[PDB]
Ligand binder design. Structure first.
Ligand SMILES: [Ca+2]
Ligand SMILES: [Ca+2]
Ligand code: NA
Lengths: 51, 129
C-alpha cells in the first residue's frame, strides 16, 4: 500500500498525539452482547400434534 | 512618576497613549500566547503573520447620546476587513487570536456618564421572531 505520511509531502508543525486506538482492538470491537436469534415457546393445554 | 492613569501600548507599527486610564484588565488573568505542541490539533505548519496583522485597527466611531442604549461587536467579525489580519483570516480554514481592546471616550470635567465595557465569551444573542 501507499506508505507516505504528511511530513513527507508538506511542511508540518510538531503535534503531540495522546490519542489511542483502544476502542478498535478486537476485544473492544467485539465487546458487546448481540442478539443472534428469537425463539418462541408457549404454555397451554395442547390437544393436537401441532399444538 | 509612573501612574495607573498613564499608559502606552505598542503593537507592530501602531501605538496608543492614554493619560486617564484605570489600570488594564487581563481577562481571566491570562495573557494571550501561541498554541503549544502539546495542545495542538491541525498538523500543517501554521502561518503566524506577526506584525502585519497583530496591530491596532481603529473601527468607525459611534456617537454616545443621552438616549443611546448601547453597542455590540463580535470578534473576530469586527476585524474581518482589517488589513492583513482579514486576509490571513479568510485565506485559512482555521485561526486563533487574542486581542488588546482599547475603548476611547473623552469628555470634560463638567460632563458625566458611565459606560460598562464587557468582553463576553460565546456571546450568543436572542433572535427577533
Ligand atoms: Ca516536510
Ligand atoms: Ca511569520
Ligand atoms: Na503519540
Amino acid at each position: 500500500s501507499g506508505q507516505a505520511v504528511p511530513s513527507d509531502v508538506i511542511e508540518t508543525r510538531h503535534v503531540v498525539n495522546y490519542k489511542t486506538r483502544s476502542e478498535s482492538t478486537l476485544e473492544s470491537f467485539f465487546g458487546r452482547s448481540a442478539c443472534v436469534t428469537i425463539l418462541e415457546v408457549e404454555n397451554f393445554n395442547a390437544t393436537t400434534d401441532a399444538d | 512618576g509612573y501612574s495607573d492613569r498613564v499608559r502606552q501600548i505598542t503593537l507592530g507599527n501602531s501605538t496608543i497613549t492614554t493619560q486617564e486610564a484605570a489600570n488594564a484588565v487581563v481577562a481571566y488573568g491570562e495573557w494571550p500566547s501561541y498554541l503549544d505542541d502539546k495542545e495542538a490539533n491541525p498538523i500543517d505548519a501554521p502561518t503566524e503573520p506577526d506584525v502585519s496583522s497583530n496591530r491596532f485597527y481603529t473601527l468607525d466611531s459611534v456617537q454616545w447620546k443621552s438616549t443611546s442604549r448601547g453597542w455590540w461587536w463580535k470578534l473576530p467579525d469586527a476585524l474581518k476587513d482589517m488589513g492583513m489580519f482579514g486576509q490571513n483570516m479568510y485565506y485559512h480554514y482555521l485561526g486563533r487570536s487574542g486581542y488588546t481592546v482599547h475603548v476611547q471616550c473623552n469628555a470634560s470635567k463638567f460632563h458625566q456618564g458611565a459606560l460598562g465595557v464587557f468582553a463576553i465569551p460565546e456571546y450568543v444573542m436572542a433572535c427577533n421572531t
